[PDB]
Structures are given as structure tokens and as C-alpha cells.
Amino acid sequence: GSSGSSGRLCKALYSFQARQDDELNLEKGDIVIIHEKKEEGWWFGSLNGKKGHFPAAYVEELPSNAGNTATKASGPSSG
């Protein structure tokens, strides 16, 4: 599609409650951007704009994102 293929994606099967800021909170059916997974189960990525350490067993790697998330705004010569 678009020049990329750098970060992987995944869906949170079970909602995770990040005890502290160290970990990352996940919600049932949440797409997280896989940044780095150089750990056993402990994955690293951003959910909704916030990065952190979340479990793998909770999320599941996906081949492609879900449907198509986009919006249409207007401004000073937006496009």
C-alpha cells in the first residue's frame, strides 16, 4: 500500500490493566502498534497514542489493520 512495513500490528483479545505507567493498558478489541518485541511475551508498542510494555498472550499479531480508519476534516488549504 503505502511506503512502510516497519511496525507490526495486533489486536488485544483480553483487556489488560496496566498496574503502573511502565505497562500499557489494553482494551478488548484494541489495535496496538507493535514497536519492539525483544522480550518473552512482553511486547512494546502504542495503543491509542501511548506506548508501553504489554503482554503478548493478551494481543494477537495480525496481517493487516482493521477495515479502514480515516477521517475528513477541513482547514487552511488542507488538501
UniProtKB/Swiss-Prot annotation:
Functional note: Multivalent adapter protein which may decrease NOS3 activity by inducing its translocation away from the plasma membrane.
Q: Which gene encodes it?
A: NOSTRIN
This chain belongs to the protein called Nostrin
Quaternary structure and interacting proteins, as annotated = Homotrimer. Interacts with DAB2. Interacts with NOS3, DNM2, WASL and CAV1. Interacts (via SH3 domain) with DNM2; this interaction allows the recruitment of NOS3 to dynamin-positive structures.
Q: Which residues of the full protein are shown?
A: 441 to 506 of 506
Q: According to the UniProt entry, which residues carry Phosphoserine?
A: 46
- Taxonomic placement: Eukaryota, Metazoa, Chordata, Craniata, Vertebrata
Expression across tissues = Expressed at highest levels in heart, kidney, placenta and lung, and at lowest levels in brain, thymus and spleen. Present in vascular endothelial cells and placenta. Over-expressed in placenta from women with pre-eclampsia (at protein level).
Recorded source organism is: Homo sapiens (Human)
Domain comment (free text) = The SH3 domain mediates interaction with NOS3, DNM2 and WASL. The F-BAR domain is necessary for membrane targeting.
Tell me which residues make up the SH3 domain: 8-64
